[PDB]
């Protein structure tokens, strides 16, 4: 790529401008992706935070397990060893000065909580600080939780179930608040299941457990929709853009062709050049994403991993190479004499 590379020194402004638009695109993706992986955790972060390998549910109709319609009998709790019972309820919480609905999860006393949340399951109720503020209550006060008086044992951080912050309470309290003999709603398995399930039981990978949350499903539609139109419109807009860019090279390409440049040669040159400008632009746009993203996690939800930035970047770089290929194939397709008709 003799010519391709010196085009860049010869006009570093022009190429900055093109790396901008490629980077700006990688930005828009890395941003929206993590802003929507954000809303997604508004249903899932709490059980995610609890990191179970498998989670055993309960249905009787052999149907899809559901967090709303499953419960673990105190004897069920022993047919699974190395298991912890988790209670998931949504109930009204009420202080003297305000009220709200909120998710209540129950674990056995002393269960260490996710560091995402911090602490240990004490007796009584551990409130998200933001929830305690809202209610205007502190550790030691009394709240009504599902009509039962419960003591605020202390505050903690905020993970979430079905769009509300989780209040962490001990099994007995969760039993009181949810009005049930059951010890929990599901069982949490940290290793793998060294046993099999009855006709009415069913293990799920933590991925499947989301399927059992009623708010997850009725939304997972609306998020994938965004995740999809984003990647579609984007990849097309990129392939198109690199095409109109590489097309500014028709003349020089046509001259080179006439002198005898083979189409591989010209493809190599055009790809090698786009490679460099693309790589600069995705690197730069995926950088300002992470940073500008990590810098915004609160006051805004924003989940972002590494298959979530290096994932798109390798996707634009791959797609931008294509759009250049479309342009070079277009010029090199025709007898050089006609291409020099573009030259004027």
């Amino acid at each position: 790529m003799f010519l391709g590379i010196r085009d860049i020194r010869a006009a570093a402004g022009r190429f900055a401008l093109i790396a901008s638009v490629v980077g700006l695109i990688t930005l828009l993706i890395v941003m929206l992706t993590g802003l929507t992986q954000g809303l997604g955790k508004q249903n899932t972060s709490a059980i995610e935070a609890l990191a179970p390998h498998s989670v055993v549910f309960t249905t009787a109709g052999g149907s899809s397990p559901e967090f709303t319609s499953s419960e673990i009998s105190e004897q069920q709790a022993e047919r699974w060893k190395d298991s912890t019972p988790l209670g998931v309820s949504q109930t009204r919480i009420e202080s003297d000065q305000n009220a709200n609905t909120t998710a209540v999860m129950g674990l056995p006393e002393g269960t260490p909580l996710p560091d995402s949340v911090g602490g240990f399951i004490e007796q009584g109720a551990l409130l998200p600080a933001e929830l305690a503020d809202f209610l205007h209550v502190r550790a030691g006060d009394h709240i009504t939780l599902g009509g039962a008086t419960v003591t605020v044992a202390g505050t903690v951080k905020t993970e979430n179930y079905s769009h509300t912050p989780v209040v962490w309470v001990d099994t007995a309290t969760w039993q009181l608040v949810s009005h049930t003999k059951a010890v929990g709603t599901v069982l949490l398995l940290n290793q793998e299941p060294t046993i099999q399930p009855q006709d009415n039981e069913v293990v799920t990978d933590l991925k499947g457990a989301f399927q059992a949350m009623p708010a997850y499903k009725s939304e997972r539609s609306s998020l994938l929709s965004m995740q999809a139109f984003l990647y579609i419109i984007s990849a097309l807009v990129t392939v198109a853009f690199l095409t109109v860019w590489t097309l500014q090279r028709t003349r020089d390409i046509a001259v080179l062709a006439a002198l005898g440049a083979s189409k591989r040669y010209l493809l190599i040159d055009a790809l090698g050049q786009a490679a460099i400008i693309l790589a600069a632009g995705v690197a730069l746009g995926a950088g300002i994403g992470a940073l500008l993203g990590w810098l915004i996690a609160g006051s805004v939800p924003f989940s972002l991993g590494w298959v979530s930035v290096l994932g798109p970047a390798l996707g634009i770089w791959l797609l931008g190479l294509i759009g250049a290929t479309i342009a070079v194939r277009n010029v090199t397709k025709v007898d050089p004499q006609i291409a020099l008709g573009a030259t004027a």
Partner: peptide, 23 residues
Amino acid sequence: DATSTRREHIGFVFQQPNLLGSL
């Protein structure tokens, strides 16, 4: 083929200079 012919066996002094503008 035509292109390899030009590349290997022909010299062109184009009617106009056709110089590549960044070299």
